Amino acid sequence: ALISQSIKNLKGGISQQPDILRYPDQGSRQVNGWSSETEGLQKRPPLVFLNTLGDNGALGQAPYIHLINRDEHEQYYAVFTGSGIRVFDLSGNEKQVRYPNGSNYIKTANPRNDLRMVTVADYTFIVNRNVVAQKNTKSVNLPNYNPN
């Protein structure tokens, strides 16, 4: 006999629980939304364009990305393509990536499964999880040294 409710806080979020399970306010699918606390439910912020990078395979098929915030005026990406490294600025430019020791360490068929990067304030470090750290031979201190 003339019931009324007021679902008042649509912060919510999707829930694929059944109908007689849910809380209020949730919803069954929510695309491009943004559920702030005070203001209710907005259209998401609109993705301002910055400079493009290259072709379709300019990065790898499934690359590894790691952002670097050293300072307020020193900000860089680091994309690990299956063959080599590109590095993009946060404004859309591109720096060059030298290889004075030879690369031979980033080349992996699946870079996000297998390479890492851990960045600290003074250094950066990348680890391949597929290369076995080999013992150095042919650099012994004294070659034979008959000890008597």
Binding site: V31, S35, P46, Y77, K95, V118, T124, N128, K135, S139
Partner: protein, 298 residues
């Protein structure tokens, strides 16, 4: 005896010069000194693989097959004591993770006071009883949860978020420090009411403590950024929201990171590869002009 590791099968680095471009250098891992093979042991990663770099009390550190290998206190690139006569409290430590079962170490995330180290079926806290770090450094397993090996457990506030290996339609878990006990960890399920929503391969976990969300990319439906917006208030969580952002169909989102309130996103079309900026401004104007902040997706 040999006194070097091959400098190429070790982790490299990526250091910038003053010219502007990035170099990709090896690291000069210092020569072994003052010992033998049988008394200055090989550093327990020279026959297997390294998985992570992590810092812990002035010491550079690697994970290994099952081992944790922390470097010397003052000098990062040195895994050998200064003299095997007179052990001098700054020597590198080799603490094998002692388990009942098999656990190969894969990540290292600092959480509350501990810098705990995770591996694929169990979770391990690395703290000592006594000084900072001597050869006496403890290692115990707190919570034996399951964690996927292709996403790095990302921390926002008091929590750390991570993925779990279901077969299909995987899950994300909130990782606590409980209130009542001193040092008991816990992992809840913040997809316990939304399964069947995030497809299989969580390869990046974003976040920002400013706008209070965590998001997850996935290589099972790569056009979707799976947002999880939360808001803690008086120690009780008041918003378990989920969504997913599409940037148009047939468009692959291949990264997501966020400096303070700007989410810089590269995203792949079927012809190009972009770069973008999602700004959480309220009434401000994105570009110079634009009379009403036009919601435009590019």
């Amino acid at each position: 005896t040999e006194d070097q590791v091959l400098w190429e099968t070790m982790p490299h680095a990526l250091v910038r010069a003053a010219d502007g471009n990035f170099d990709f250098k090896w690291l000069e891992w210092s020569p072994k000194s003052c010992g033998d093979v049988d008394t200055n042991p090989w550093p327990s990663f020279v026959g297997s693989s390294i998985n992570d770099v992590f810092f812990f009390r002035n010491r550079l550190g690697f994970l290994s097959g099952e081992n944790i290998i922390l470097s010397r206190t003052a000098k990062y690139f040195n895994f050998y004591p200064a003299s095997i006569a007179n052990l001098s409290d700054d020597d590198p430590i080799d603490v094998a993770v002692s388990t009942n079962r098999i656990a190969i170490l894969k990540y290292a995330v600092p959480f509350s006071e501990e810098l705990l180290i995770w591996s694929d079926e169990a979770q391990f806290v690395l703290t000592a009883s006594g000084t900072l770090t001597s050869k006496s450094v403890e290692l115990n397993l707190t919570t034996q949860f399951d964690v996927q090996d292709r996403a790095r457990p990302f921390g926002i506030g008091r929590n750390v978020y991570f993925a779990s290996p279901r077969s299909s339609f995987t899950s994300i878990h909130r990782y606590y420090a409980v209130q009542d006990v001193s040092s008991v960890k816990n992992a809840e399920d913040i997809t316990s009411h939304v399964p069947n929503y995030i497809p299989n391969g969580v390869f990046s976990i974003c976040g920002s403590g400013t706008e209070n969300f965590c998001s997850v990319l996935s290589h099972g439906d790569p056009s979707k950024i799976f947002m999880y917006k939360f808001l803690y208030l008086n120690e009780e969580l008041r918003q378990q929201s989920w969504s997913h952002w599409d940037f148009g169909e047939n468009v692959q989102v291949l990264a997501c990171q966020s400096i303070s309130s700007d989410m810089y996103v590269i995203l792949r079309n079927e012809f190009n590869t972009f770069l973008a900026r999602i700004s959480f401004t309220k009434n401000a104007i994105d570009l110079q002009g634009e009379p009403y902040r036009a919601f435009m997706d590019m």
